[PDB]
RNA sequence: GAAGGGAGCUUGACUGCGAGACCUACAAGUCGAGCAGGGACGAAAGUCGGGCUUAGUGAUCCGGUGGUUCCGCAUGGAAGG
RNA sequence: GUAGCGAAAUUCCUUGUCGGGUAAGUUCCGACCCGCACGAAAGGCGUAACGAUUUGGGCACUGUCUCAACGAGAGACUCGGUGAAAUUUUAGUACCUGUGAAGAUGCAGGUUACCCGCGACAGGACGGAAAGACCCCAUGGAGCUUUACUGUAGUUUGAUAU
RNA sequence: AAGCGACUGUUUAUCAAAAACACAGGUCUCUGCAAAAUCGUAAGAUGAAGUAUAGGGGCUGACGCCUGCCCGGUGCUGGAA
RNA sequence: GGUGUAGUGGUAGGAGAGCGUUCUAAGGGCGUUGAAGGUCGAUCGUGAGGACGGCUGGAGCGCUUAGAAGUGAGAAUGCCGGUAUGAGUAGCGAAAGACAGGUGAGAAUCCUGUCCACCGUAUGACUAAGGUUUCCUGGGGAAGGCUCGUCCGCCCAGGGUU
RNA sequence: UAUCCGGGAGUCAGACUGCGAGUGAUAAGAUCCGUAGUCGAAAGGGAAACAGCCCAGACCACCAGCUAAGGUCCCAAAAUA
RNA sequence: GGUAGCGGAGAAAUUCCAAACGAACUUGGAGAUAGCUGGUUCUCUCCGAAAUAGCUUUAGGGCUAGCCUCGGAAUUGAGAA
RNA sequence: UUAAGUGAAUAAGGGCGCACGGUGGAUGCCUUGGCACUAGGAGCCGAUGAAGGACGGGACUAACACCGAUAUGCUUUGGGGAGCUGUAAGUAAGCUAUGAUCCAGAGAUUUCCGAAUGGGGGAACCCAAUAUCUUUUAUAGGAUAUUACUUUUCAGUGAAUACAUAGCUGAUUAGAGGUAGACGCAGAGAACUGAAACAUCUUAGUACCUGCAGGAAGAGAAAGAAAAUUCGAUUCCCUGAGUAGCGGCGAGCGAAACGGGAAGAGCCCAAACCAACAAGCUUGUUGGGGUUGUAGGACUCCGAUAUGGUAGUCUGUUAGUAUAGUUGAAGGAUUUGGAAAAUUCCGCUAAAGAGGGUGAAAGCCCCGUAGACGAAAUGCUGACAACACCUAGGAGGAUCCUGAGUACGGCGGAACACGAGAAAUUCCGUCGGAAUCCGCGGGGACCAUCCCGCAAGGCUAAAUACUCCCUAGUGACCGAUAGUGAACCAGUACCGUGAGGGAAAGGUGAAAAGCACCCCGGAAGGGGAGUGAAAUAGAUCCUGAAACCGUGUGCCUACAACAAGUCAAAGCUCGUUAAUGAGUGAUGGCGUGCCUUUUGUAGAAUGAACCGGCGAGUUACGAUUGCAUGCGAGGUUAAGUCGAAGAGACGGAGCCGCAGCGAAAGCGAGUCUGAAUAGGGCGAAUGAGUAUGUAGUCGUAGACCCGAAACCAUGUGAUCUA
């Protein structure tokens, strides 16, 4: 703003007798180069819902998974080695081709690394999961301990 | 401001002060004291534990305002005559923590 | 999170200017002196649409006095004349028939001094 | 039919109020039957909360005087409210 | 309120009255004194010399004027070269009378007027230039004054310490 | 020939050069020296390496003739019951 | 959705519903077989506005839903830039130049010569300050020079202060 | 339609005409009230032009019709009724 | 070479102090304050004022009320003619 | 033929439409650079000469960059492996597998000015002394080292003056100055402004100035907070709360404790007393001793010579880390094209589908990324060790010690939210002036009781504040009038005596392939010919708007009074988004611009020369209402911890609501007034709230934008003028 603007302290011409539009300084906000009035300033835009809400939102939407039947559960994903190929062979396997939320347990380290470069998956710690993930995924890929972890959480 | 008309505040005279001993107590109601079962103890703590009070204040004071219909003992830092009536007659008891 | 000026100014300018092609000089080449003649325009526009009925009834009732006269008749008359006998034909249609059919003006004419003299 | 005038006795030129009204931007202003307390006058009815009615007045802050079963910075006092 | 001076750098009434000067003098000079409202160091009165001081008269001198005429040069004017500015809502930008925010190129009625220029003038465009300095207002500003209010540097007086 | 200013000077750079300022002269008053006065918080300076025939301040303004009355009021100076 | 009845001027101002701009998310698209942008057109909607063609252009951009705003200009004697009007107008800044010859693409303006004219207690000759290479030599004619220029205190390259 | 409760205002320069008064001179396009209208914030028709007068309130299209004020010899629509 | 802005200097004019001096210039407090003037950008629909009262160091400002708008509650329907 | 009547066409110029140019630089797209932050690092540099400069160094050298007479660089240790001699072309001359250029660590050199310090001085210059060395036969000349001032310590000399002291000399010691326009503490300390005036008050202990600093500072180990009975240094965050209070009781100002968290750490002297030393039984130095409030300590008795700890150390050893690096998967064809990454067909890789570049948009072409690996040298951190420094229990009180011109009081100021007020508590100046354990201070005047503590001595990490810089990133941040003033040789040009003010200016193309040659011309500039996908991409170079200027012409225009239009319309010309079309338009009707401000403006009231761009109700924190969602007599977390700068989880301290009435004690569906079971007021009967989102309005902030004359505080000016 005009305040912060570099220069800008005398007063560019005398009030009277120019002729001239009359100024107070060369950085006023209709100079060219001149501050700027309001616009943009640092600020935060979070903010917290209640409780209750954000508990109800997230098992409204793992809620509406089910319900669609877009929620595929495994019994376990174990890869020997992190293989990117491998995991893309599971999802073929249980014939998931869109977006898909992999939720996996901690410490499944090696399917998480697999399955994480894949330009469809997006892979999330059943502790860590969030609306915003699950509302994104068109399935989500579950394995049971994970499902487990949720209910406890939930 | 009354654009240079005495305000309103300036009219009226100061009143009273504060009672820097001034106590307050957390008020119950015998409509509450019915939500519990009959022979429960009812003390402070119970009362917070149960979030019907939540801030206790100089302490709780029991009222009259509803019918009782539990027999019930009753902790309390006070009670209205009425309510210590009421408690009693229900079969009750009353002690002043 | 900035919006420039863009496009749209000079789109919204243009459209006045088109709309003032023709004017003379300044008042079809410069948006302030165009928009201040559309503007004109518009209310010129706007009142000349309810002028113009009036114009052409004007127009058609000359005429037919014109006619009338020459059929031994005023206007003030032949209308009367021609109410007298429910006729409903309008003034359009009747200064129509004036310059172009005289002989079915001439009847017309006829009908309404005869509804007069009765 | 006095609200004008005179006489006797008196102090209602009362205390706590006050349904409801008028006036009114507010703050204010005006009228009020009636209830209770305790009275004046009158045999009684009953009248009396000043004067025939309408002017004779000034917000708050601050300070003085009197009363008060109110408060009293650990407690009892006090200081001060 | 003395001396002195007085219609004055002071006299409003006032071009006071009288005299001088002029054919004619609200100015000027001399005098008078009802000094609206002179006056003795914020000096009174007078004064040789001095003054790009103010005032009146005269001689000389003249285009200052009667009353304007001619001539020289620079600009202006034509041509070649170079080439701004203030102003500017758009303008195909008449006159009279009237109307209208009461003073019209633009509105009404009437009149006049072929199209485009060049050299001149300045009546109008309430012409340009400067958000009027006059006037009023703002619970504006500034400089200044004082026996305005409240302070205060200094100066001084007392107690006290050294 | 009259007014004003004695005079030579000085002044509003850029609308006023004058009757305005200065001036020599007059007068009043302060100042005994670390003088008074002034600059400075102070130190330190000017006054002045001067000393009442000197220095500061106020007024008047060459020269000539003169400069009347009032000390109640306000200042200053002195007094001290 | 249909019918009927009624209603629909409007400043300050209140309410409602929308258009368009940039960006984010998601989805679904379009682009060297030509995106955005620009330009023209006789196109659509009740309005802000939206399409579709031709041309230009040469690499990014729509659409739907939601979200966030440096979100819309015609006026502030507004700021910046560009360009007009006045206008081929004012002005071209105290004074004498003439002609012949030369140079050169080009000469009133540069060089040479002759005459003429001007200053001469200066417009001459020295120096201090200040300026700081403007000095000399050879080139140049973009710009600067109030015209011109082959010329210059200008530009280019060398050199010069013992 | 009125109330009452709440959110958001703007307004505190008014003008003229008719009628009733004051001030003024029984002047003012004056001034100050009361009352109605219009303008303000209202386009259209009439009053030559002419905010406030007369008629009348524009959501739009029409080269249809009937009227209001005001008009009908020509400009200029309609009676040389 | 010296004197510097709460200042200097002034033969005194508010006169000079770097082309505007009743208090220099520059930077900062600083986006001083401005009941004052100017400006404030797309569209359509519904409704639509006021220029008054009271009080005001108040009079071209402001506050409450009056007049407008949006939502709501309720009624023995209380409004208008 | 005569007469009467009608009578087109022409354009000196102009208008409209259209087409094509020019000028100019908007728009679009793009980006060298910015903006706001996050994580980590680093938080100082200087007499061993700094920051910042001047002048120099290149084969050519004007500028920038780098370097300093060892000058476009030298040495050394590592990295890297083919070009390299900057910008920056062009020559010229060279270097490089004997490993160059280049990258990182360490070191050498580092002119002159500058605190600048041998002296002087108008900065980058001048002139010296001493000693050694050097040139000359010799003087002159040259090089090197030392030579400021003050402070510390020491030594010698040494006055008035006898001793002395002062001074003087030398040696020794550590300071000066600059910053990072930030943060901290302190001294000094405004005004505009608000209060609708203004003085108390507010702005505000703010701006400015000055001092001192440190990487943080400050505070800090109770003469405390309290009175639930208890807590146990300090700091900071949430909350208490806009409460208690202060206040021309106005405008405003405004806590603290409790509670919840971040972080946590406690220690030294003085004194008593002891030992030694020295002089003059005390009195100073040294060492021991001892350190406190359930009083401690001395001192006297006993018993232990351990037990633990540390906020120490250029002490190593070790690990890790920072400063270069190495490695790092997978595609070919087909169509369009100048060019493929695009299209189409089949593949392949993925612990790598982050990102950037490549002739258009690339997982598989390149640089990279995931991942793996890497350090000679020098820092940093952590451990281990070493060294070092602290670290005693019990019982007695006879006596001694436990901070004096102090605490405190009067007067005058100031700080505490608290403006002298009833005013504690803290501090300054001045004067007066205590007690000391049976003692002293405090618990908001004061006293008594009770409780809590032990001043007048010192030190102390962490949580906290800030970012000039460095490294790695981020963004519903800017995209050349924006974003830093500065994307570009910017604090430059330019302006000013000076302080100081302060610009403008980005884009050819994929690649210069930057137009050989020819032609007009003195050139400039053009036309060909070429390059190119494109030259109307030709360097004023992407796109190329509008104003403005011009060329061509389809229609109109020389009897007309014109806010320039609109409505009606002949004629002429032309044929589109194919529409009851388009351009022009004789002629006729109606008709005084836009805006602002007004009772009223065409107004002869204001504003705009035109065009383009830029240019004004926003955000944060609170209040309140509507709407929406969740929960519901309940609602909800704040700080903080973990987590991607996210969601989320925990966190119930706290806030709102469920009870009101009263000034208050207090009572309570009632309560207050009152003598009152009266009346009346406010409430209950007669219940919905709360968290968040969103919108309207308000408050605090510049608060919709622009504008004073002015006020105040540092500085710069007597080159004009007095
Ligand atoms: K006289
Ligand atoms: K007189
Ligand atoms: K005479
Ligand atoms: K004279
Ligand atoms: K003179
Ligand atoms: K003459
Ligand atoms: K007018
Ligand atoms: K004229
Ligand atoms: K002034
Ligand atoms: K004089
Ligand atoms: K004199
Ligand atoms: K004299
Ligand atoms: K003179
Ligand atoms: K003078
Ligand atoms: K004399
Ligand atoms: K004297
Ligand atoms: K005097
Ligand atoms: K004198
Ligand atoms: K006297
Ligand atoms: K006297
Ligand atoms: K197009
Ligand atoms: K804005
Ligand atoms: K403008
Ligand atoms: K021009
Ligand atoms: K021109
Ligand atoms: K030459
Ligand atoms: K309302
Ligand atoms: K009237
Ligand atoms: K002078
Ligand atoms: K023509
Ligand atoms: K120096
Ligand atoms: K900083
Ligand atoms: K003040
Ligand atoms: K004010
Ligand atoms: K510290
Ligand atoms: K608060
Ligand atoms: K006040
Ligand atoms: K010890
Ligand atoms: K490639
Ligand atoms: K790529
Ligand atoms: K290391
Ligand atoms: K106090
Ligand atoms: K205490
Ligand atoms: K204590
Ligand atoms: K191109
Ligand atoms: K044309
Ligand atoms: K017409
Ligand atoms: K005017
Ligand atoms: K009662
Ligand atoms: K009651
Ligand atoms: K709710
Ligand atoms: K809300
Ligand atoms: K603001
Ligand atoms: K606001
Ligand atoms: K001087
Ligand atoms: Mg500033
Ligand atoms: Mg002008
Ligand atoms: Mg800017
Ligand atoms: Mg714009
Ligand atoms: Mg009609
Ligand atoms: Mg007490
Ligand atoms: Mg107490
Ligand atoms: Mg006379
Ligand atoms: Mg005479
Ligand atoms: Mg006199
Ligand atoms: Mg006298
Ligand atoms: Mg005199
Ligand atoms: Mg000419
Ligand atoms: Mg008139
Ligand atoms: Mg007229
Ligand atoms: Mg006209
Ligand atoms: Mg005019
Ligand atoms: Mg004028
Ligand atoms: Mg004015
Ligand atoms: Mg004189
Ligand atoms: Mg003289
Ligand atoms: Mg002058
Ligand atoms: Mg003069
Ligand atoms: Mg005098
Ligand atoms: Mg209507
Ligand atoms: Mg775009
Ligand atoms: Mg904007
Ligand atoms: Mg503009
Ligand atoms: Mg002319
Ligand atoms: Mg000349
Ligand atoms: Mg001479
Ligand atoms: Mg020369
Ligand atoms: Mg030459
Ligand atoms: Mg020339
Ligand atoms: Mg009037
Ligand atoms: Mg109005
Ligand atoms: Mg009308
Ligand atoms: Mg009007
Ligand atoms: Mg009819
Ligand atoms: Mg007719
Ligand atoms: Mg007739
Ligand atoms: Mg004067
Ligand atoms: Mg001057
Ligand atoms: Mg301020
Ligand atoms: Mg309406
Ligand atoms: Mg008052
Ligand atoms: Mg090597
Ligand atoms: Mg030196
Ligand atoms: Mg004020
Ligand atoms: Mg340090
Ligand atoms: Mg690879
Ligand atoms: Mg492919
Ligand atoms: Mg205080
Ligand atoms: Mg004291
Ligand atoms: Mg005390
Ligand atoms: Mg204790
Ligand atoms: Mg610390
Ligand atoms: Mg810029
Ligand atoms: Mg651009
Ligand atoms: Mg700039
Ligand atoms: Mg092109
Ligand atoms: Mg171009
Ligand atoms: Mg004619
Ligand atoms: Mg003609
Ligand atoms: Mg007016
Ligand atoms: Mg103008
Ligand atoms: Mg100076
Ligand atoms: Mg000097």
Not at chain 1, 121 to 127: H, K, L, M, Q
Not at chain 2, 6 to 15: A, G, I, Q, V
Not at chain 2, 20 to 39: C, P, Q, S
Request: aromatic share 8%; charged share 30%.
């Amino acid at each position: 703003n005009r305040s912060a603007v570099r220069g800008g302290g005398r007063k560019p011409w005398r009030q009277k007798g120019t002729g001239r539009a009359r100024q107070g300084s060369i950085r006023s906000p209709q100079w060219r180069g001149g501050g700027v009035v309001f616009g943009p300033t640092p600020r935060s835009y979070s903010y917290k819902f209640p409780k209750k809400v954000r508990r109800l939102a997230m098992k409204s939407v793992l809620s509406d998974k089910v319900a669609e039947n877009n929620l595929v559960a495994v019994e376990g994903l174990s890869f020997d080695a992190p293989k990117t190929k491998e995991f893309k062979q599971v999802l073929a396997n249980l014939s998931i081709d869109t977006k898909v939320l992999v939720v996996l347990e901690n410490g499944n380290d090696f399917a998480a690394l697999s399955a994480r470069n894949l330009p469809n998956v997006s892979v999330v710690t059943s502790d860590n999961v969030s609306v915003l993930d699950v509302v994104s995924a068109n399935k989500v890929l579950a394995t049971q301990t994970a499902l487990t972890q949720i209910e406890e959480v939930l | 401001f009354e654009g240079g008309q005495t305000p309103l505040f300036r009219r009226l005279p100061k009143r009273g002060f504060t009672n820097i001993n001034r106590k307050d107590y957390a008020v119950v109601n015998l409509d509450t004291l019915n939500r519990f079962e009959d022979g429960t103890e009812v003390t402070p703590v119970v009362l917070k534990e149960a979030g019907i009070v939540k801030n206790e204040k100089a302490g709780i004071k029991v009222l009259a305002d509803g019918e009782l219909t539990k027999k019930l003992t009753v902790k309390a830092a006070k009670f209205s005559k009425s309510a210590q009536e009421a408690i009693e007659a229900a079969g009750g008891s009353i002690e002043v923590i | 999170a900035r919006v420039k000026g863009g496009t749209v100014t000079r789109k919204r300018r243009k459209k006045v200017l088109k709309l003032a092609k023709g004017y003379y000089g300044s008042k079809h080449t410069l948006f302030k002196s165009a928009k201040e003649q559309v503007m004109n325009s518009y209310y010129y526009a706007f009142r000349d649409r309810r002028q113009k009925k009036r114009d052409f009834r004007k127009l058609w009732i000359a005429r037919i006095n014109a006619a009338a006269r020459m059929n031994g008749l005023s206007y003030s008359k032949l209308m009367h004349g021609l109410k007298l006998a429910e006729i409903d034909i309008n003034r359009k249609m009747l200064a129509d028939l004036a310059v172009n059919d005289a002989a079915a003006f001439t009847a017309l004419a006829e009908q309404a001094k005869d509804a007069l003299s009765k």
